[PDB]
Design a protein around this ligand. Structure first.
Ligand SMILES: *[C@@H]1O[C@H](CO)[C@@H](O)[C@H](O)[C@H]1NC(C)=O
Ligand SMILES: *[C@@H]1O[C@H](CO)[C@@H](O)[C@H](O)[C@H]1NC(C)=O
Ligand SMILES: *[C@@H]1O[C@H](CO)[C@@H](O)[C@H](O)[C@H]1NC(C)=O
Ligand SMILES: *[C@@H]1O[C@H](CO)[C@@H](O)[C@H](O)[C@H]1NC(C)=O
Ligand SMILES: *[C@@H]1O[C@H](CO)[C@@H](O)[C@H](O)[C@H]1NC(C)=O
Ligand SMILES: *[C@@H]1O[C@H](CO)[C@@H](O)[C@H](O)[C@H]1NC(C)=O
Ligand SMILES: *[C@@H]1O[C@H](CO)[C@@H](O)[C@H](O)[C@H]1NC(C)=O
Ligand SMILES: *[C@@H]1O[C@H](CO)[C@@H](O)[C@H](O)[C@H]1NC(C)=O
Ligand SMILES: *[C@@H]1O[C@H](CO)[C@@H](O)[C@H](O)[C@H]1NC(C)=O
Ligand SMILES: *[C@@H]1O[C@H](CO)[C@@H](O)[C@H](O)[C@H]1NC(C)=O
Ligand SMILES: *[C@@H]1O[C@H](CO)[C@@H](O)[C@H](O)[C@H]1NC(C)=O
Ligand SMILES: *[C@@H]1O[C@H](CO)[C@@H](O)[C@H](O)[C@H]1NC(C)=O
Lengths: 135, 135, 135
C-alpha cells in the first residue's frame, strides 16, 4: 500500500468551510494549486523464475500415513440452556442479546497444506464498529 | 493498493461549504487547479517463467494413506434450549436476539491442499457496522 | 487496485454547497481545472511461460488412499428448542429474532485441491451494515 487514510468526518485537500450563524463578508480568496503525482509501484524484472516440485518413491512401504491441514475443528460442543420460570412477576427485557459464534470479517488467503508462491500479498480492512446501541 | 480512503461523511478535493443561517456576501473566489497523476502499477518483465510438478512412483506399496485439507469441521453440536413458563405474569420483550453462527463477510482465496502460484493477491474490505439499534 | 474510496454521504471533486436559511449574495466565482490522469496498470511481458504437471505410476500397489479437499463439514447438529407455556399472562414480543447460520457475503476464489495459477487475484468488498433496527 501507499496511501491508506481513515477520516472520521471530513477529508479535504482544501476546505473553505463556514459554519452556521456566521457572517462572511468582504472576502477575497485567491488559490493556485499545482499538484503532481508520479507512481511507480510493483515493477518486477525477472530474467528467469523457476519453481520445481519433485516427488520420487521407490520400492517403499508406507502405512498409517496421515496428513491434516490447518483449521481442524473436532468434537466441539456448545450448550447454552435458557430456562425462565415466572410466578406473578413483571418481566421487562428491553434489549437482551444471546450471541454464539458471531463473525463479522473473515478474510482467508493461502491457507493450504503445501504452498509455493511468489510476489505480493496484501490485506486491508477498514470498518467503523457498533455492536449494541440501546437508547 | 495505492490510494485507500475511508471518509465518514464528506470527501472533497476542494470544498467551498456554507452552513445554515449564514450570511455570505461580497465574496470574490478565484481558483486554479493544475493536477496531474501518472500511474505505473503492476508491470512485470519475465523472460522465462517455469512451474514444474513431477510425481514418480515405482514398485511402491502404499496403504492407509489419508490426506485432509484445511477447514475440517467434524462432530460439532449446538444446543440452545429456550423454555419459558408463565404464571400470571406480564412479559415485555422489546428486542431480544438469539444469534447462532452469524457471518457477515467471508472472503476465501487460495484455500487449497497443494498450490503453486505467481503474482499478486489483494483483499480489501470496507464496511460501517451496526448490529443492534433499539430506540 | 488503485483508487478505493468509501464516503458516507457526499463525495465531490469541487463542491460549492449552500445550506438552508442562507444568504448568498454578491458572489463572483472563477474556477479553472486542468486535470489529467494517465494509467498503466497490469502490463505483462512474458517471453515464455510454462506450466507442467506429470504423474507416473509404475508397478505400484496403492490401497486405502483417501484425499479430501478443504471445507469438509461432517456430523454437525443444531438443536434450538423453543417451548413457551402461558398461564393468564400478557405476552408482548416486539422484535424477537432467532437467527441460525445467516450469511451475508461469501466470496470464494481458487478453493481447490491442486492448483497451478499465474497472475492477479483481487477481492473487494464494500457494504454499510445494519442488522436490527427497532424503533
Ligand atoms: C466591502 O468592499 C466594498 C468594496 O471594496 C466596500 O465598498 C465595502 O464598504 C466593504 N464592506 C464593508 C462592510 O466595509
Ligand atoms: C498561481 O496563481 C497565482 C495567481 O496570480 C500566480 O501569482 C502564480 O504565479 C501561479 N503559480 C503557478 C505555478 O502557476
Ligand atoms: C526493467 O526493464 C529493464 C530490464 O531489466 C531495466 O533496464 C529497467 O530499468 C527496468 N525497469 C524499471 C522500471 O526498473
Ligand atoms: C494404524 O495401524 C493399525 C494397524 O496397523 C490400524 O489398526 C489402525 O487403524 C491404523 N490407524 C489408523 C488411523 O487407521
Ligand atoms: C459589495 O461590493 C459592491 C461592489 O464592490 C459594493 O458596492 C458593496 O457596498 C459591497 N457590499 C457591502 C455590504 O459593502
Ligand atoms: C492559474 O490561474 C491564475 C488565475 O489568474 C493564474 O494567475 C495562474 O497563472 C494560473 N496558473 C496556471 C499554472 O495556469
Ligand atoms: C519491460 O520491457 C523491457 C524488457 O525488459 C524493459 O526494457 C522495460 O524497461 C520494461 N518496462 C518497464 C516499465 O519497466
Ligand atoms: C488402517 O489399516 C487397518 C488395517 O491395515 C484398517 O483396519 C483401517 O481401517 C485402516 N484405517 C483407515 C482409516 O481406513
Ligand atoms: C452587489 O454588486 C453590485 C454591482 O457591483 C452592487 O451594485 C451592489 O451594491 C452589491 N450588493 C450589495 C448588497 O452591496
Ligand atoms: C485557467 O483559467 C484562468 C481564468 O482566467 C486563467 O487565468 C488561467 O491561465 C487558466 N489556466 C490554464 C492552465 O488554462
Ligand atoms: C513490453 O514490450 C516490450 C517487450 O518486452 C518492451 O520493450 C516494452 O517496454 C514493454 N512494455 C511496457 C509497457 O513495459
Ligand atoms: C482400509 O483397509 C481395510 C482393510 O485393508 C478396510 O477394511 C477399510 O475399509 C479401509 N478403509 C477405508 C476407509 O475404506
Amino acid at each position: 500500500s501507499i496511501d491508506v487514510k481513515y477520516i472520521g468526518v471530513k477529508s479535504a485537500y482544501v476546505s473553505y468551510d463556514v459554519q452556521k450563524r456566521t457572517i462572511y463578508l468582504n472576502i477575497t480568496n485567491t488559490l493556485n494549486i499545482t499538484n503532481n503525482n508520479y507512481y511507480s509501484v510493483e515493477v518486477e524484472n525477472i530474467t528467469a523464475q523457476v519453481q520445481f516440485s519433485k516427488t520420487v518413491i521407490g520400492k517403499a512401504r508406507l502405512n498409517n500415513i496421515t496428513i491434516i491441514g490447518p483449521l481442524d475443528m473436532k468434537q466441539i460442543d456448545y450448550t447454552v440452556p435458557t430456562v425462565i420460570a415466572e410466578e406473578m412477576s413483571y418481566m421487562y427485557d428491553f434489549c437482551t442479546l444471546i450471541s454464539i459464534k458471531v463473525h463479522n470479517i473473515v478474510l482467508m488467503m493461502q491457507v493450504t497444506v503445501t504452498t509455493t508462491y511468489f510476489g505480493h500479498s496484501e490485506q486491508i480492512s477498514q470498518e467503523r464498529y457498533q455492536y449494541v446501541d440501546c437508547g
